[PDB]
Structure formats: C-alpha cells, structure tokens
Amino acid sequence: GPSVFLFPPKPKDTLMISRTPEVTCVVVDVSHEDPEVKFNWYVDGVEVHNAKTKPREEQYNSTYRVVSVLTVLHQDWLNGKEYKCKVSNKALPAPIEKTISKAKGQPREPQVYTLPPSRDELTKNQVSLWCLVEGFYPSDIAVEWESNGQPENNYKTTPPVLDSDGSFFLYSKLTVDKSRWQQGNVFSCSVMHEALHNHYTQKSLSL
Amino acid sequence: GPSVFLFPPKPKDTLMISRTPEVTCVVVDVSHEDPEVKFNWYVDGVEVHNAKTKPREEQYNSTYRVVSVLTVLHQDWLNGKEYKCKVSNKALPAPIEKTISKAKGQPREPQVYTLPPSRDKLTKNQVSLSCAVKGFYPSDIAVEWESNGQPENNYKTTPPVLDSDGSFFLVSKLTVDKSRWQQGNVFSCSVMHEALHNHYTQKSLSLSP
Numbered sequence: 417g418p419s420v421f422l423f424p425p426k427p428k429d430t431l432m433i434s435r436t437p438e439v440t441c442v443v444v445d446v447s448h449e450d451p452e453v454k455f456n457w458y459v460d461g462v463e464v465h466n467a468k469t470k471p472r473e474e475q476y477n478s479t480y481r482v483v484s485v486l487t488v489l490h491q492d493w494l495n496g497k498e499y500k501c502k503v504s505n506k507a508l509p510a511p512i513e514k515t516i517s518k519a520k521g522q523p524r525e526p527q528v529y530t531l532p533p534s535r536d537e538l539t540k541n542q543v544s545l546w547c548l549v550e551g552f553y554p555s556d557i558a559v560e561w562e563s564n565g566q567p568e569n570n571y572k573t574t575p576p577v578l579d580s581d582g583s584f585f586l587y588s589k590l591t592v593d594k595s596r597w598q599q600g601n602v603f604s605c606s607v608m609h610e611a612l613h614n615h616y617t618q619k620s621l622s623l
Numbered sequence: 624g625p626s627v628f629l630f631p632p633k634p635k636d637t638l639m640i641s642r643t644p645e646v647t648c649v650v651v652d653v654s655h656e657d658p659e660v661k662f663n664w665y666v667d668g669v670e671v672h673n674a675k676t677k678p679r680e681e682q683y684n685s686t687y688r689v690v691s692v693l694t695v696l697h698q699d700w701l702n703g704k705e706y707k708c709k710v711s712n713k714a715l716p717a718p719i720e721k722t723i724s725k726a727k728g729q730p731r732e733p734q735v736y737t738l739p740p741s742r743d744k745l746t747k748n749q750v751s752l753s754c755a756v757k758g759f760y761p762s763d764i765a766v767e768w769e770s771n772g773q774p775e776n777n778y779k780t781t782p783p784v785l786d787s788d789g790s791f792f793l794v795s796k797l798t799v800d801k802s803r804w805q806q807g808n809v810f811s812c813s814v815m816h817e818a819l820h821n822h823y824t825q826k827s828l829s830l831s832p
C-alpha cells in the first residue's frame with residue numbers, strides 16, 4: 417500500500433510574520449488501480465478544512481504522488497499545536513495517520529558571537545568570518561550572513577550540535593575576499609529563533 | 624541464518640604509530656544446531672593468517688555471537704588496502720563476505736585556526752574557545768584539547784561539513800571557567816589527519832593583553 421510522509425514548515429517561515437508557513441502531507445506509491453486519496457487534517461484533534469490538495473502527479477516508477485498542503489498560523493505552530501494528516505485510499509487496510517508538531521522543550525535564547533579571521537589565515541586571498549551561535553533550544557534556527565543589507569550567501573553552517581548542558585550550538589563560516597575584509601567592510605550574522613526578542617538578532621563584524 | 628558486520632579501525636588508531644588499529648568481524652544469529660563458524664581474512668585478496676578469533680558467546684536470545692579481530696598495519700590501511708572477512712557456517716547456503724577499506728579520495732591538508740572568545744562572552748562565567756579546522760579531505764579526523772599536560776573534558780566538536788570547494792570543515796568548542804582564561808592559561812587544540820605532516824598538528828590559545 418501507499419506511504420505517507422508529513423513535513424514541518426521551514427523555521428524561518430514560522431518565525432517571520434511576513435512569511436507563510438505550511439505543513440506538507442506527501443503520499444507516495446499511489447497505484448493506478450486505486451488513484452483516489454482523501455486527506456483529513458486536524459489541529460490539536462479538531463478537524464480543519466482549509467487544506468489545499470495538489471494535482472496528483474505520476475512518477476517514473478510509474479505510480480502516483482499526491483500532496484496536500486495546510487497553511488499554519490505562526491503562533492499555533494510556536495505554541496506547540498499538533499498537526500495530523502489522515503490519508504485514505506481504497507488500497508489501504510486502514511487510513512494512515514501522521515502527526516507532527518514543533519520540537520518540544522523549554523526554549524533557550526541563542527547567544528550570538530562573531531569571531532574575526534585568524535592571523536594565520538591573512539595570507540591566502542580569502543578569509544573566514546565565523547558566527548558562533550550557542551546555548552539555544554530547540555534546534556530549529558535560521559542563520560544568515562549579509563553586508564550592506566544584501567545577502568552574502570558564500571557561507572556554510574554546521575548542523576546544531578547538542579552541547580553538554582542540553583542546549584545546542586553551531587558555527588556559520590562565511591568566506592570573503594581578504595581585500596573586502598582589510599578595507600573595513602562590515603559583515604553581519606543574522607539569527608532567527610523562537611527564543612529571541614522579535615525572533616531576530618543581528619551581530620556585526622569588521623576589521 | 625547468521626549475519627556479519629565488519630567494522631573499521633578508529634581514525635586516531637591508524638594515524639598514531641603507538642596505537643593498534645584493528646578491523647573487527649562480528650557474526651550474530653549463529654544457531655545452536657550449526658554453531659561452528661570459520662573466518663578467513665584477506666588483504667587485497669591475499670589470505671592472511673594472524674587474526675585472533677574469540678570463543679563463541681551465547682546471547683540472551685539463545686543465539687551465539689562470534690568475533691574475529693585482525694590487527695592492521697597503519698600504512699596498509701592508509702594506503703587503501705581492502706580487508707575482506709569471509710564467514711562460513713553450515714546453516715548458510717554459501718559463505719558471507721564483507722569488505723572494508725579507508726574512505727577514498729585525494730587527501731587535502733587541514734588548516735587549523737584557534738579563535739579566542741568574543742568580548743561579549745567575557746561577562747558570562749565560562750568562555751568558549753574555538754578550534755576551526757578547514758579544507759581537509761577525507762572526513763576522517765580526530766580533534767582533541769589539552770592544557771598544562773592534561774586533556775580537557777569540556778568540549779564538543781561539530782561533524783565534518785562539506786564546504787563549497789569539496790573539502791570538509793568543522794569547529795571544536797572548548798568551554799572553560801572564565802577565571803582560568805583570565806589567569807593566562809594556555810589551551811591547545813590537537814588535530815590528527817592523514818594529510819598532516821606526522822599526521823598531527825597543534826595550535827594553542829591564551830589570553831592576549
């Protein structure tokens with residue numbers, strides 16, 4: 417029978433009020449013999465009716481893939497409400513039920529520190545700027561770099577690491593031309609997390 | 624029927640001549656009816672005879688577990704030789720073969736940088752010292768901290784992260800009581816990797832007035 421996978425919104429979508437967070441229910445292996453899928457959606461066990469189900473679409477293993485998308489309210493997600501997808505198909509013994517919610521646990525505020533390049537490194541032609549983010553919980557987070565209001569996207573960020581106190585830390589490494597650094601340009605690490613005021617902080621770094 | 628799991632040596636063990644790297648071939652779900660198990664070991668397809676095999680040990684699920692350990696030459700592992708464990712048992716249709724070797728790819732030398740605490744952290748009680756290791760390949764690496772001739776307990780290291788140029792980086796975070804940092808104590812990040820001279824390099828950090 418078919419399989420169902422339920423996916424959360426993007427952290428940045430739940431944290432920025434301008435954005436629209438979505439929960440996504442994906443049904444795979446819908447065979448031709450029975451192509452019809454019914455989605456029932458529930459928030460905290462109360463059924464809701466505003467999900468939008470997409471035109472089911474045929475895959476190369478020649479079976480079907482069906483997707484329903486439910487817009488969530490930012491504060492519902494952040495307040496820990498549970499989102500249940502129920503998938504009904506002729507070919508199932510019983511309907512499939514998947515439930516998802518925000519990672520549980522007492523929130524803890526990220527501490528954000530920018531670290532300049534090592535001396536050592538001032539001899540190649542690029543330098544590494546570092547954004548250390550530590551002490552946060554849960555691990556859902558968004559970390560971005562910019563300069564003069566523009567995204568600097570030539571960076572890589574480690575996954576969150578569980579630290580000895582049960583909080584998480586990570587490191588974002590931004591690589592820039594050494595000339596940009598030596599000439600005094602200002603670079604900024606932006607962090608978005610539920611435990612921050614306005615879900616947002618920015619820390620800047622320059623020579 | 625029985626199942627076989629073949630485990631590699633730890634990276635540090637292959638990089639330090641004083642340590643003993645081993646490949647471990649583990650057989651589980653050996654029956655009471657057919658308890659005999661034979662190991663044959665091959666290095667690049669050439670049979671070798673010096674493995675040390677343990678007596679079978681019964682588990683709480685009434686099956687046996689049997690382990691054979693092959694000591695490997697550091698340089699054989701680092702030169703990419705293939706280690707094959709072949710397991711024979713009368714309950715099996717044919718012997719089970721498993722093969723393992725070091726991760727492949729052109730080695731690249733890690734660059735190691737220590738990063739002092741942010742000033743923002745100095746009013747916190749504990750400060751975080753950073754050891755950034757970048758540009759290395761393959762991802763097998765060991766990173767350790769010490770001070771004053773003893774290891775430091777209180778550090779965590781990120782997994783290797785694939786960078787935009789195809790190499791890996793990571794960072795190691797050592798948390799210390801702020802007094803010890805202000806004290807002037809020297810802390811040292813040691814990195815062990817196949818592409819380092821002597822498979823080892825160390826960088827140190829202490830408060831700069």
Ligand SMILES: *[C@@H]1O[C@H](CO[C@@H]2O[C@@H](C)[C@@H](O)[C@@H](O)[C@@H]2O)[C@@H](O[C@@H]2O[C@H](CO)[C@@H](O[C@@H]3O[C@H](CO[C@H]4O[C@H](CO)[C@@H](O)[C@H](O)[C@@H]4O[C@@H]4O[C@H](CO)[C@@H](O[C@@H]5O[C@H](CO)[C@H](O)[C@H](O)[C@H]5O)[C@H](O)[C@H]4NC(C)=O)[C@@H](O)[C@H](O[C@H]4O[C@H](CO)[C@@H](O)[C@H](O)[C@@H]4O)[C@@H]3O)[C@H](O)[C@H]2NC(C)=O)[C@H](O)[C@H]1NC(C)=O
Nearest residue numbers: 419421423424425426437438439440442444445475476477
């Ligand atoms: C027939 O084919 C289909 C499809 O095959 C694929 O497509 C074809 C064309 C070829 O390219 C194939 O090579 C492909 O495989 C097969 O369907 C697959 O079935 C698998 C099960 O057998 C299933 O495995 C499970 O995957 C989960 C993760 O899936 C993620 O991530 C992968 C990437 O690694 C990706 O392929 C999936 O699409 C899915 O991606 C996420 O999608 C969601 C939904 O859109 C995204 O979230 C939304 O995104 C939007 C913006 O896009 C917005 O942000 C919304 O707000 C947000 O909600 C999300 O961003 C995507 N993430 C990523 C990373 O891409 C696993 O988690 C799961 O693990 C389970 O088991 C684990 C241990 O085993 C457990 O620990 C764990 O808890 C889980 O329980 C499974 O491994 C594949 O996902 C599925 N592929 C697709 C495309 O649906 C089908 O099986 C095959 N049939 C046969 C008979 O072979």
Ligand SMILES: *[C@@H]1O[C@H](CO[C@@H]2O[C@@H](C)[C@@H](O)[C@@H](O)[C@@H]2O)[C@@H](O[C@@H]2O[C@H](CO)[C@@H](O[C@@H]3O[C@H](CO[C@H]4O[C@H](CO)[C@@H](O)[C@H](O)[C@@H]4O[C@@H]4O[C@H](CO)[C@@H](O[C@@H]5O[C@H](CO)[C@H](O)[C@H](O)[C@H]5O)[C@H](O)[C@H]4NC(C)=O)[C@@H](O)[C@H](O[C@H]4O[C@H](CO)[C@@H](O)[C@H](O)[C@@H]4O)[C@@H]3O)[C@H](O)[C@H]2NC(C)=O)[C@H](O)[C@H]1NC(C)=O
Nearest residue numbers: 628630631632633644645646647649651652682683684686
């Ligand atoms: C009957 O019982 C046996 C025994 O189990 C015990 O007794 C039972 C009754 C219960 O009480 C259990 O709770 C007990 O543990 C069962 O045997 C198990 O069978 C499993 C398969 O069915 C098998 O699963 C596979 O596990 C692999 C990981 O094994 C690691 O890690 C686990 C911990 O997570 C650990 O328990 C294992 O012992 C093994 O530990 C590693 O050992 C190696 C070798 O010693 C270590 O490497 C050496 O270390 C030294 C120094 O320490 C030196 O560095 C050497 O250089 C080096 O070689 C290594 O450090 C250890 N690692 C860790 C983390 O400790 C998985 O990889 C594997 O996954 C793969 O295959 C899967 C499919 O099976 C895939 O899904 C997957 O993707 C992978 O491809 C399996 O999950 C168990 O290991 C095995 N347990 C033991 C103890 O052998 C038996 O199943 C059961 N039968 C029945 C019918 O019920």
